[PDB]
Amino acid sequence: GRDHRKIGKQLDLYHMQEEAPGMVFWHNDGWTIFRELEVFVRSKLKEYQYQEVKGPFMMDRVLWEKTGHWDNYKDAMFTTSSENREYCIKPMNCPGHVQIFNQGLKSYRDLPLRMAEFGSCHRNEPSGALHGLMRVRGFTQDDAHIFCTEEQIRDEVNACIRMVYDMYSTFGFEKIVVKLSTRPDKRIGSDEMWDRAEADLAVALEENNIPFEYQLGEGAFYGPKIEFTLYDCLDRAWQCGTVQLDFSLPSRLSASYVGEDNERKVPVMIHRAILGSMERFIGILTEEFAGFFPTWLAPVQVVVMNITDSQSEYVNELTQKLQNAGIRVKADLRNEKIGFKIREHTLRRVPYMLVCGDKEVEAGKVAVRTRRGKDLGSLDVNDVIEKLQQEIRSRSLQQL
Amino acid sequence: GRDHRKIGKQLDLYHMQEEAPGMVFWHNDGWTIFRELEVFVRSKLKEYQYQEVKGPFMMDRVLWEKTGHWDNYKDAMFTTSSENREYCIKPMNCPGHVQIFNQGLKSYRDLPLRMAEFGSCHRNEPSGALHGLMRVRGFTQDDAHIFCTEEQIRDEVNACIRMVYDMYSTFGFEKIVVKLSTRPDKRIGSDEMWDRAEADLAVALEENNIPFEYQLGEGAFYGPKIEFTLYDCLDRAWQCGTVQLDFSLPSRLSASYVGEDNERKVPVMIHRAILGSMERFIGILTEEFAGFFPTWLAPVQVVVMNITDSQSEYVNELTQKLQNAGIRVKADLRNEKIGFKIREHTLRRVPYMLVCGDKEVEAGKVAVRTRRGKDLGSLDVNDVIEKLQQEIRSRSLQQLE
Numbered sequence A: 001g002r003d004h005r006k007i008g009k010q011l012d013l014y015h016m017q018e019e020a021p022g023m024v025f026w027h028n029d030g031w032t033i034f035r036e037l038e039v040f041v042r043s044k045l046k047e048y049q050y051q052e053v054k055g056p057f058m059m060d061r062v063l064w065e066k067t068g069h070w071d072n073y074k075d076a077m078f079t080t081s082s083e084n085r086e087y088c089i090k091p092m093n094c095p096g097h098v099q100i101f102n103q104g105l106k107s108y109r110d111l112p113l114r115m116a117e118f119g120s121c122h123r124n125e126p127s128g129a130l131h132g133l134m135r136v137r138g139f140t141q142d143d144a145h146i147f148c149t150e151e152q153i154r155d156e157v158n159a160c161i162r163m164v165y166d167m168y169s170t171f172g173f174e175k176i177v178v179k180l181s182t183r184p185d186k187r188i189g190s191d192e193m194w195d196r197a198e199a200d201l202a203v204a205l206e207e208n209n210i211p212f213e214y215q216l217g218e219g220a221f222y223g224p225k226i227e228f229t230l231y232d233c234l235d236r237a238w239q240c241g242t243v244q245l246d247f248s249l250p251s252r253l254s255a256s257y258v259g260e261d262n263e264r265k266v267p268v269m270i271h272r273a274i275l276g277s278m279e280r281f282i283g284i285l286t287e288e289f290a291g292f293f294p295t296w297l298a299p300v301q302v303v304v305m306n307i308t309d310s311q312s313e314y315v316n317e318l319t320q321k322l323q324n325a326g327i328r329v330k331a332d333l334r335n336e337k338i339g340f341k342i343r344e345h346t347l348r349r350v351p352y353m354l355v356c357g358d359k360e361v362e363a364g365k366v367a368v369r370t371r372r373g374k375d376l377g378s379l380d381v382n383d384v385i386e387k388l389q390q391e392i393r394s395r396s397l398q399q400l
Numbered sequence B: 001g002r003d004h005r006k007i008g009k010q011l012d013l014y015h016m017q018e019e020a021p022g023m024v025f026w027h028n029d030g031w032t033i034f035r036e037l038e039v040f041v042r043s044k045l046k047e048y049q050y051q052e053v054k055g056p057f058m059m060d061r062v063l064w065e066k067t068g069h070w071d072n073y074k075d076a077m078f079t080t081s082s083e084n085r086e087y088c089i090k091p092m093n094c095p096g097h098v099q100i101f102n103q104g105l106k107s108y109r110d111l112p113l114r115m116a117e118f119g120s121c122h123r124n125e126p127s128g129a130l131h132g133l134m135r136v137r138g139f140t141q142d143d144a145h146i147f148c149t150e151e152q153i154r155d156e157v158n159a160c161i162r163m164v165y166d167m168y169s170t171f172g173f174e175k176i177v178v179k180l181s182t183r184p185d186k187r188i189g190s191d192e193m194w195d196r197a198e199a200d201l202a203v204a205l206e207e208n209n210i211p212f213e214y215q216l217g218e219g220a221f222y223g224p225k226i227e228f229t230l231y232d233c234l235d236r237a238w239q240c241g242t243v244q245l246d247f248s249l250p251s252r253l254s255a256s257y258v259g260e261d262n263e264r265k266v267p268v269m270i271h272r273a274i275l276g277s278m279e280r281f282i283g284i285l286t287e288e289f290a291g292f293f294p295t296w297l298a299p300v301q302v303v304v305m306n307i308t309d310s311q312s313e314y315v316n317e318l319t320q321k322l323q324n325a326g327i328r329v330k331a332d333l334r335n336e337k338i339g340f341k342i343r344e345h346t347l348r349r350v351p352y353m354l355v356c357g358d359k360e361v362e363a364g365k366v367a368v369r370t371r372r373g374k375d376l377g378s379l380d381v382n383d384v385i386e387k388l389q390q391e392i393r394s395r396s397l398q399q400l401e
């Protein structure tokens, strides 16, 4: 029993309905998980030196036909109109990122320019194939685009690779399969361009001792790509990560920069996503942990509870201390038995349950108990807050 | 200058294009401002006990036709189709909030249920009427909908009112004009219901000692409302806040709860937004401050800089300390004169320029220069960091002395 649909209903994370096929209603607790995942990605964006931008939801069809994706993907577009002009709701964030790149004069000094976005994308997929958070219409891509020179591709692909494995290992995903898609029959650019582009991805992987299988037929018309597939605890494959070279879209959208020789060069563009889809990754995480989210991701991290009315003031004071320390905490002061209380929050998958009786109030302590059923006993209040802070801020998979 | 369109280009906050009319492209520095504003609103949502949800971008026309807004507002709807079904791109967040409310059986004990959202709304407005961040098509509403009983209305409107003045006072807006819109000709509900609903709004304003005025017959068909018009430093009026009672939508979308008497009851809905639009409000703030955003909102809060090559490592350490202290900081180690460095970052509206000369490195201090051109002297590094943190924590309008 690890269905994300089931756990999503039980823990009141999200729901879906027929009026909005493949588009998620995020409830309070599920939206908390979403935002903590977002905060985690932002810390990595800062570490790996990315800008974070936000592009518009719609854009003119005139611009979308200039991208070169229209013929292959017009059936997957959501279109709307206003004042005799047809606009596409964006399925990808790349054209919008080029529009920001084109504002102001760029030079080689500004490259590599790394532009990230939590980009809300909509794709008009057949409704019959939709299921849960795994196959959806509306989703949020942990997207970024790297504008760089031909000489900087090698280093930026290395950095993307490091960022992929770093982020996957945070959630305990160590079994990764890597696939390098080579030149297709369609394709733009010369054979010498594809020789170099394919070598840049291959050597970057080889130098990091990462084994990979070639995918000969597959690969986009605008460049080769690396795709990363993680494996969950049921040994199910999930293609999440991508690193995709592009020698087309920047030229077609009039992107350029002044080089060191004062000539106009078209920048090389690297598409990349790691989690793939925020909704989809949450689904995978919900199943991986079976509702037992690590404390940093958990909607409710601690519940503090009393035995009788005698300890209510102490529990309220302890609740405020935990809230002051940046912990998501609730107080359970109901007139129920301690076994009833602990069970409700053990079923809700609350990492820690802080019991406070007369023993604990007089001592300045708290009786800590995990959702796994491990009784840690009466511990000092300041010691508990300190260890919870470390677990949350280090983003540890394991409890005490 | 106080033109947000000019300043937006100068500080590289955002831009707009004819390919996406009335829809903002947020650059790094503008999106940084957006996200801190979002964090600020979030802390108020936590304080005033709101849930935060996220609804889908589109929903079937069939559901939108049931809301009772369709015939009045179908011209303003963006529409898209898929598999013989028509979907509206959401212009408002209320129906989606009702869909979330309708999941699970609700009790009187769950009320008042306060459900907030940073709701990305799209209104198909005329392109000739568009103008920068203020008049837009795509925007993010600091929205919330309170589901409550009839008896709970006064206390919830009272809370909303407090939240409005609280949030406006953070940005330096004390002069608020308040307008209570009364019953229109075409309306639902009995006159007895409208007497209580209008009285609930008036009593809540009286309870907060707020003088207001009527706007006669300007209320919506589904209930009366309060609107809050703030005044900037140029004495220009901006209608941002709204608190709108609703006796229609919950019933139209099958919203109910189990009462204390065990009867099925329909909840009353209070629509409310304080800032009104995140894009619009940032635009107003840009002109209010003239680009001199308070330190907590500033894209780059501190720039640490060296006079000569001698202090480059001291700058690196100091920049790392400010990095570890959660301050948005950059190091200016370019081979340029100290005045050149100060003039550029004064023009970019960086609150503080932490200057490092030989005398500062030797004493373990830093020379603090504000964007207003003032000299705060050479202070201890750990003192300055604690003071900057306190200025950011409290979201202070004023810089250090």
Ligand SMILES: CN[C@H](C(=O)NC/C=C/Cn1cnc2cc(Cl)c(Cl)cc2c1=O)[C@@H](C)O
Residues within 6 Å of the ligand: A069, A070, A073, A074, A076, A077, A091, A092, A093, A094, A123, A143, A144, A242, A271, A272, A273
């Ligand atoms: C092309 N952008 C990248 C991306 O999304 N890569 C994953 C796979 C993309 C394939 N893909 C899938 N569906 C699409 C649907 C539409 Cl309507 C369009 Cl116009 C493009 C695509 C499209 O390109 C990100 C990583 O920047």
Ligand SMILES: CN[C@H](C(=O)NC/C=C/Cn1cnc2cc(Cl)c(Cl)cc2c1=O)[C@@H](C)O
Residues within 6 Å of the ligand: B069, B070, B073, B074, B076, B077, B091, B092, B093, B094, B123, B143, B144, B145, B242, B244, B271, B272, B273
């Ligand atoms: C709709 N409720 C509130 C709100 O947005 N009020 C501000 C103004 C509302 C007036 N308004 C303006 N434009 C609209 C456009 C459309 Cl396509 C629809 Cl369906 C409704 C409205 C509509 O009601 C929020 C705060 O919950």
Ligand SMILES: [Zn+2]
Residues within 6 Å of the ligand: A092, A093, A094, A145, A271, A272
């Ligand atoms: Zn892309």
Ligand SMILES: [Zn+2]
Residues within 6 Å of the ligand: B092, B093, B094, B145, B271, B272
């Ligand atoms: Zn509303």
